[PDB]
Design a protein around this ligand. Sequence first.
Ligand SMILES: [Cl-]
Ligand SMILES: [Zn+2]
Ligand SMILES: [Zn+2]
Ligand SMILES: [Zn+2]
Lengths: 204, 205, 205
Amino acid sequence: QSYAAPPTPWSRDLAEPEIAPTAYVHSFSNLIGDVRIKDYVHIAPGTSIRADEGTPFHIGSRTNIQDGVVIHGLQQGRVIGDDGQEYSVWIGDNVSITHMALIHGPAYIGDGCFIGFRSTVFNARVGAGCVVMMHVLIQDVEIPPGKYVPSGMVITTQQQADRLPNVEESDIHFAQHVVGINEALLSGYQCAENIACIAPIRNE
Amino acid sequence: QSYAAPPTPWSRDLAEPEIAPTAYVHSFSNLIGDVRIKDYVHIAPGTSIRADEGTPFHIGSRTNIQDGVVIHGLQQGRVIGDDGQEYSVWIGDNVSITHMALIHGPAYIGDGCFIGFRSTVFNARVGAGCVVMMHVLIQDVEIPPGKYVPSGMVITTQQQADRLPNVEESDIHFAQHVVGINEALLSGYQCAENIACIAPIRNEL
Amino acid sequence: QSYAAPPTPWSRDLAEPEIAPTAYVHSFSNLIGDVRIKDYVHIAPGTSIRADEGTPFHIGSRTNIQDGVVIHGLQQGRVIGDDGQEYSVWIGDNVSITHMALIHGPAYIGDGCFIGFRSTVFNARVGAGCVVMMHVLIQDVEIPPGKYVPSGMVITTQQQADRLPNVEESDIHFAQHVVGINEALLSGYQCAENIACIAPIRNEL
Ligand SMILES: [Cl-]
Ligand SMILES: [Zn+2]
Ligand SMILES: [Zn+2]
Ligand SMILES: [Zn+2]
């Protein structure tokens, strides 16, 4: 369920989502505007990705976007993607954006991040390899690369973002497991759409 | 995707939403019961507004309801609207109910309010011109007009509600911007649903 | 929108949901895999219940699942249900899972529980007859039966779980009311899909 961006004083290109053929988007979801989805992305049910104000959005390869997630952006304000271009929202490679998370542009999330349940990133950079846990708010700050954020933290000042602990080895594996589970899920959903793949399994 | 209220021990009128022709409601949403939606309202994808228990709901002119929002109400309990009528939920004019907010009747939200990301108003009055920030709970209280609520606050007592700072000039300016932005989006989406409007635009590309 | 579980290294049975004819599931929602939904269950708009990683899920009789709720499970990790079978998610009878709640397996929620607005149970056991309020996180712990949890609490250690107050009689009556309300909603929505039932009601208008 994908649509063009609406014509507004700030946008007239009527841009539509670019989705990799290796990605899987569940039917029960809504995608509007210039949303660039690279290889092996899994977009789960109940999600609304809306690139009508702030635009464009980038979602990197092997990244998962889980149930009930919202992605939107402010009309004014951008970050620099790794390609040199400006984005309302940049999410890197091998990122997990988990259940009911909110990612609000301007926002940069680096490669390998885990963003936990019901957590929000708004007007903020989160460095590569961060593990952010459950019920967290991050707003108006830069989180250094490789940091761990405990559940329930409300981070609104740089002073707070500057005193976070380094991730442990167990956090790094925990994060890569979630990435792998969603790659496996994506392929299974693609198999079920194809008579040649699903028929032999269904006969057993 | 608009439906009548179901028949229950407390209701039998099977009421359906009244939507102003100048409003825009996204396809990917669900609307049930006596929901009265006024001029230039924008209702975004993922929203569930359900007037099957407490009823009616009123959503005022130039108000936006953003993605993943839920509105419901308790069967018992009402607020007095600006028209003298009883409502489960009353949302005024020029209001922003932003991403993932929950408004739960009995509730009154006054003209010009901003209700921030993932925030909840339940069994409460929020006076006109309040600016509520992110991840806030407001419950069983009255917030005076023109107050600012910092992010993360869990307000459950009147003692807390009585000790809030006044909104600042830059808060007002931020609130009005969000209102105007959404007015512009609704007219854009209506153009896309009209061949005469959107065709000449796609021709320029 | 009812879907089979996908073929995967941990599951190839392609299970689909089993839904009691006396349950009402709103159209605007998504169900995937081995989800066992019992008698008189109400599933509200905007819900996603997904048994593709952890599986199976169990939802008991007269239980309600309200708007925007998400249910999922870890691939590894199970709890024992009251039937003596293993589940990623067990939700018992006469339970309320309210607006925007998240239940994430491994999870057990006993009979008679109230789980409040925007609250989370993950890798946890919540005993029979608990009343959990609003904007709560319960994580990695066991809450004994008959306990009350104030709004906004973040419970991540057993030490917190061990110092909770008992429910009061008024909390019990409050919980059963919400269950009763949702049963009455359920039969109303079914009445509207039965011409015998809805025809005389509509002719009064
Ligand atoms: Cl939420
Ligand atoms: Zn926004
Ligand atoms: Zn309710
Ligand atoms: Zn999960």
